[PDB]
Amino acid sequence: LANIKREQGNIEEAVRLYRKALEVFPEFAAAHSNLASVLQQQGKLQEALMHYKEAIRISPTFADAYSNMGNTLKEMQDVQGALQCYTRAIQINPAFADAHSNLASIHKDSGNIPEAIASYRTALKLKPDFPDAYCNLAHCLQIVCDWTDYDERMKKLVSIVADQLEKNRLPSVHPHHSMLYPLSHGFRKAIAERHGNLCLDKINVLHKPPYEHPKDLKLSDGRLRVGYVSSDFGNHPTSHLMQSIPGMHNPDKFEVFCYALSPDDGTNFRVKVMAEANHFIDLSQIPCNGKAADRIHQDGIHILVNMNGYTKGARNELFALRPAPIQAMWLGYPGTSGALFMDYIITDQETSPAEVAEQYSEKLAYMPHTFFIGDHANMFPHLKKKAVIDFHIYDNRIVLNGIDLKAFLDSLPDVKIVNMPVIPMNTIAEAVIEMINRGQIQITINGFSISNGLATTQINNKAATGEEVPRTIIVTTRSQYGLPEDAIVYCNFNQLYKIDPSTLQMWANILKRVPNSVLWLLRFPAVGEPNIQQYAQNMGLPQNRIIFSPVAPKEEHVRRGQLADVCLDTPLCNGHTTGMDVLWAGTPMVTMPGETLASRVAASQLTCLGCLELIAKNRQEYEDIAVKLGTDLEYLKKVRGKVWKQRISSPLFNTKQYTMELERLYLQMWEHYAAGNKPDHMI
Amino acid sequence: LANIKREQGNIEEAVRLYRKALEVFPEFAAAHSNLASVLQQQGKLQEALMHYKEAIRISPTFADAYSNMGNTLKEMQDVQGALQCYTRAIQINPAFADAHSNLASIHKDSGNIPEAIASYRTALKLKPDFPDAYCNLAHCLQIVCDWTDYDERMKKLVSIVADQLEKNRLPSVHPHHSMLYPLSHGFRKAIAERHGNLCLDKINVLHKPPYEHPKDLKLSDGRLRVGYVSSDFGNHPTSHLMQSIPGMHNPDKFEVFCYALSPDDGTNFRVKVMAEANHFIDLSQIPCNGKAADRIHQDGIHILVNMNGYTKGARNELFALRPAPIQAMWLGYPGTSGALFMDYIITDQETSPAEVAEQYSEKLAYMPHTFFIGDHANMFPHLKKKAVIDFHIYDNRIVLNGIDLKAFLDSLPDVKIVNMPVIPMNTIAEAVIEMINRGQIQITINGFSISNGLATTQINNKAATGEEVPRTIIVTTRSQYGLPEDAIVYCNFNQLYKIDPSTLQMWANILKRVPNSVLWLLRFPAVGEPNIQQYAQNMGLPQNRIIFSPVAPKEEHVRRGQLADVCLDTPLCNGHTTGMDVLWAGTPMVTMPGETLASRVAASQLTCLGCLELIAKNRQEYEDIAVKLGTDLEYLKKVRGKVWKQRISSPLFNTKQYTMELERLYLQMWEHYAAGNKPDHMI
Amino acid sequence: YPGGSTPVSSAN
Amino acid sequence: YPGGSTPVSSAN
Numbered sequence A, B: 001l002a003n004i005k006r007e008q009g010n011i012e013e014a015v016r017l018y019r020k021a022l023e024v025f026p027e028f029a030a031a032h033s034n035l036a037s038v039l040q041q042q043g044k045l046q047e048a049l050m051h052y053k054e055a056i057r058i059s060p061t062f063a064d065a066y067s068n069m070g071n072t073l074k075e076m077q078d079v080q081g082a083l084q085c086y087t088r089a090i091q092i093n094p095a096f097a098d099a100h101s102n103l104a105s106i107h108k109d110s111g112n113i114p115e116a117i118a119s120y121r122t123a124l125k126l127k128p129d130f131p132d133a134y135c136n137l138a139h140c141l142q143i144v145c146d147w148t149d150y151d152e153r154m155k156k157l158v159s160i161v162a163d164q165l166e167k168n169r170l171p172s173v174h175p176h177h178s179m180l181y182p183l184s185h186g187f188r189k190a191i192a193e194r195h196g197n198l199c200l201d202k203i204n205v206l207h208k209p210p211y212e213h214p215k216d217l218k219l220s221d222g223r224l225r226v227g228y229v230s231s232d233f234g235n236h237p238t239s240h241l242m243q244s245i246p247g248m249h250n251p252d253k254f255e256v257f258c259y260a261l262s263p264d265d266g267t268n269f270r271v272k273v274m275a276e277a278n279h280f281i282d283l284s285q286i287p288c289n290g291k292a293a294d295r296i297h298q299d300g301i302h303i304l305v306n307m308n309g310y311t312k313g314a315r316n317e318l319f320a321l322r323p324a325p326i327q328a329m330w331l332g333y334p335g336t337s338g339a340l341f342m343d344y345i346i347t348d349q350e351t352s353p354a355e356v357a358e359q360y361s362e363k364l365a366y367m368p369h370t371f372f373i374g375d376h377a378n379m380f381p382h383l384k385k386k387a388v389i390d391f392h393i394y395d396n397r398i399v400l401n402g403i404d405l406k407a408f409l410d411s412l413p414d415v416k417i418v419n420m421p422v423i424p425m426n427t428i429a430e431a432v433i434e435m436i437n438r439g440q441i442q443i444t445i446n447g448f449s450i451s452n453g454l455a456t457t458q459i460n461n462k463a464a465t466g467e468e469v470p471r472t473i474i475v476t477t478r479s480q481y482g483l484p485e486d487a488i489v490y491c492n493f494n495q496l497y498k499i500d501p502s503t504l505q506m507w508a509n510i511l512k513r514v515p516n517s518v519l520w521l522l523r524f525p526a527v528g529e530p531n532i533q534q535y536a537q538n539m540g541l542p543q544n545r546i547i548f549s550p551v552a553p554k555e556e557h558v559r560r561g562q563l564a565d566v567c568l569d570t571p572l573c574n575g576h577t578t579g580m581d582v583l584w585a586g587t588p589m590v591t592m593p594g595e596t597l598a599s600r601v602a603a604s605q606l607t608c609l610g611c612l613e614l615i616a617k618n619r620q621e622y623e624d625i626a627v628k629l630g631t632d633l634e635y636l637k638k639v640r641g642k643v644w645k646q647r648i649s650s651p652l653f654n655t656k657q658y659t660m661e662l663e664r665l666y667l668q669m670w671e672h673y674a675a676g677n678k679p680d681h682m683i
Numbered sequence C, D: 001y002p003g004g005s006t007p008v009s010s011a012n
């Protein structure tokens, strides 16, 4: 029925009519195919797949059915199956734009960005007005720092979003990507609101009543029940940030429930949150959103915490159901939900100043310092102290770190203190330098093991990922990364997609002011590297001024930031987890806070750390800060010493203090509701 | 050192010298890269990866290091990493042929055969004399039934192999693929011998002594210790064939040891072999070949059984070590090892007649009927009996099967017997036909559940894979597959790569003789379908004479063979597992045994079954057999009835009898050795 | 098969 | 990272 096709929005209604169309005429390919497409929207993947196959049985060359089948296969995680279907659709009709675009997205998912780019271009050739394809292409070009026609692209993106938002359609720019593009705050917020709307619509079709919520603390013996919901209890940045928090919650006043949206990945991160939460519930076992929300309700949750927003593995359908009376966005998602069902965003003054409450659909709930936290002190305590070898004295050329470093140092005939232990060039120092020059894995000095920082996965693969603290003394050096012994190292360790033409221009300016210096970047992904290098050269900078390294295992990545002098933050979207990483190594970060939450996190970190001289108000300042730290060597020593001492003395990496403040804010939110008020700003 | 590079074959020696080259000159990219390449040949993947990264650190645009790194990444199963490296190599040098060929093989592995084809062509454009690339291209073209320039290709393949075998190099045609190409038996055997040689060379470098082997049965209380070694104790054809065999071994005379080369995949196949073997050992935990062979030795194995040959997951290094005195190829590998370390091939008279003992490097050890066995009786007992609906009487249009079929039939007012129960067209019969026409999942008749054969994974996903017997009555019909109600169905359910131009020509001839008939093929893979259809049309056959279906779940695949009249076997390489599948459904198979073991298995199955009238001596016979079974309807009924009754009464699917014969042959082999003779032919 | 996987025999 | 995987934050 051309009817059922039209019931756009009334899903179960469309379903019931396609069924009837097949009651009149069983042999109806198009009705099978459409029935499959709507069963797929309802998440009935096996049933969908069955009707697509029926559709193809009737019409063996039905391109559109194969291309839609491939989507279903991709949801079922049969990726090769998906490929087979898309390819088949393109064989049947080589001018089918959607099939080419579906294929491209398979390539993007496997990180084959050049093959994705080429297929999105074919789709665009065939159908020049194709928003989803243009916007996805734009994300691929972003990922690899392909800035061909950059300014047109940005305007072209803004326009598509304008067109779409007017027409009430869900926009082709993903809310998580929306921070990279010069959209208005109203646009960003509205993109987010749309995605939040689709969550209501998927759950409205189960016609559940509202849940009724607890109003006292009595059923819970006076404890606030907090539920943390996340697809990232496992080897993920989220756990690298907050894995200690559940177990530090005061059990006299709080009862902690962790709701995992992902199965157990076997890592110590998942182990720790499982062991330390009062309750751990694996919602990855309970795929129906109604049941899962029911569980949440019957646990008696007072505050449910959304750690995903619009990131991989989200199930915001559960928050749409309102299983709890207070619902707050917490740390995994650097932006607004736009969704009426989220009451608060846990943030801070520096990140989200009360001026810009309008960027956000939620009420602002402030932590007193930064809302950012890091598990560095617990994951990487071997980085609390370091020693150097002297080959007059550099803090960042040849570094040793280790739980047992002090006793190693004490076994040495001569060591001086400047506090920083220095090892002079004796046999020991040459044995070390030799191990590194040879690429050898480790040596023994005085019974201690001395490890090559490059070989951590061979010595202890759990120490490499940060799931265990290393039990050897590790040596880290500038020559392991081809970095110069005799010049300033500026670093940035973020994915390349965070860089834009203005940012690379600022860096270029800084490197021209500081002739004796290099910028240290990562292959994140390696296919972005010749673009950056090409753009740098057209800005008039020689080949050797930008040094690339590969992405490293978690512990090596954090340990190696000790080799840099200064980190240059990306103003487009800052280091978040990666800002904590660089600061834990004692390396100052220069930043320029923007308008969005994502552009402002590093300034919040640095404010919490007590380094306000590192925050720029504009581009000229950012350059001047950075040139100053690469030329005024005594002021570099001061600022470095300030970072090294405040990573410990400040609140920044203090998970216990963080948890206690968080608790104080949960209670403020609770009391303001217990007394029948509705969500308002907490300060 | 240009030296170390030259130590071709003396692996640890090359290693030790590259190390020394780095002792003289630490900063030597090429030496890092070569050192990595040899560490990789020794299986030291993490160490290899470290030195590749060192090589790239010194020379950021070292294309060759990136391309070799990608291979290492691919061995570590970091597939995206591998892609990144190959792509990077091609960005740096777009004329690097090997990098393009490495990329193509990544595409082939993911089943993206058109993208693999295109990249192997680029490699061939850049380097026209590139054997590995040409031969891999040839396999891709095979897989999709791309027969462009077919005859030249075959001669081009033979020549490459001739060139290579002379020059002592390991050939670019994989021994498992060698059966598809018109090579001589001496060529095939020699290809296999080469791969067997590389296994000795990898284990020779551990300079182990010979093992010394038991000579009596005394340490084992009079029991022959048999070790079955396989990467396929899990959801694999091998387990679908032999999973019952270990537990049926006579524990008074045999002690069974299963050596898994793969981790536990969670399936009931793995569960059953684990539970029923006297001992189960997970060699996937013990990656070093020396240790694993040691374990085998200290278990006291008298006969070690190689179930892999040259198939995925093989570790023939363990057989090269000779941990046991008798070593036999058994069922997973349809050809010779060519390897001096394998004593026997368990085969039979029909498959491997004593005339052709020369095809084989091993001695022939004969099972008395076929060496082929199938677990069908145990996996699919619901297929032992069936009923039909009559909409005068067909056995293969509308079929019901079920453990509880008999009691369902007994609840019906009218049923006639012809033995075959027939259901007449009443309400019941229309309720069934209606369920199917609507694509509905199931209905209840008289309290029994009646399931749509298309919806098995929705009802019971373990029944669909064959890990459980279905607990409902399943309905299977020709209209579920678009097959004609009023004409002969010829089927072949093998992967398309088994078909060649001569085979499709024979089928075409048969379909022209039998106007009222269709050939039923599978999308295996779907990208092969328009080729077959194109070639059929150039042979003068309309669009509708060849019907494609998708690959089905294991149980549906075996159940649906009941809908065919006749199966047309592929003479190039026959149905093996798939021949057992089709016979279990009661469907006669027409075959033409060739020269190779792989071309002869179906004739052995059919001889064991007692259907000699189905075996053709040449092409004319094969056509005539097949036309005869599609036109002489009374003789089709006879031959079908003969297949249906002999799948039970003959040895073919009789796992207990098979195991007892196997035991009788193990003892013949043992006694002939106990008495210090060396391997000779057993009959 | 579309929806999961059909393991088969193939080269090492 | 080359050799395994570096999980990151990314869109749903």
Ligand SMILES: O=c1ccn([C@@H]2O[C@H](COP(=O)(O)OP(=O)(O)O)[C@@H](O)[C@H]2O)c(=O)[nH]1
Binding pocket: A236, A237, A240, A493, A494, A495, A522, A550, A551, A552, A553, A554, A555, A557, A574, A575, A576, A577, A578, A579, A581, D001, D006, D007, D008, D009, D010
């Ligand atoms: O060489 C590296 C560079 C980064 N990282 C980690 O990679 C992740 C990058 O994630 P994301 O892009 O989401 O970081 P954010 O945006 O939070 O800074 C972080 O956990 C880093 O700690 C790593 O393990 N090795």
Ligand SMILES: O=c1ccn([C@@H]2O[C@H](COP(=O)(O)OP(=O)(O)O)[C@@H](O)[C@H]2O)c(=O)[nH]1
Binding pocket: B236, B237, B240, B493, B494, B495, B522, B550, B551, B552, B553, B554, B555, B557, B574, B575, B576, B577, B578, B579, B581, C001, C006, C007, C008, C009, C010
């Ligand atoms: O639609 C199908 C067709 C085949 N098969 C199974 O797929 C495998 C094909 O494997 P292979 O090509 O090695 O079979 P062989 O060469 O032994 O006949 C066999 O287990 C078949 O039972 C399946 O499950 N569904």
Ligand SMILES: *[C@@H]1O[C@H](CO)[C@@H](O)[C@H](O)[C@H]1NC(=O)/C=C/CCl
Binding pocket: A176, A177, A178, A179, A237, A238, A241, A331, A332, A333, A334, A573, A576, A577, A598, D008, D009, D010
């Ligand atoms: C990725 O990882 C951490 C923890 O989940 C989160 O705090 C951080 O905000 C996030 N970074 C980004 O999402 C960058 C987005 C630009 Cl598309």
Ligand SMILES: *[C@@H]1O[C@H](CO)[C@@H](O)[C@H](O)[C@H]1NC(=O)/C=C/CCl
Binding pocket: B176, B177, B178, B179, B237, B238, B241, B331, B332, B333, B334, B573, B576, B577, B598, C008, C009, C010
């Ligand atoms: C695949 O599966 C079964 C069990 O492992 C084995 O008996 C059968 O011989 C095999 N079929 C083929 O290998 C076809 C090869 C042509 Cl490359």
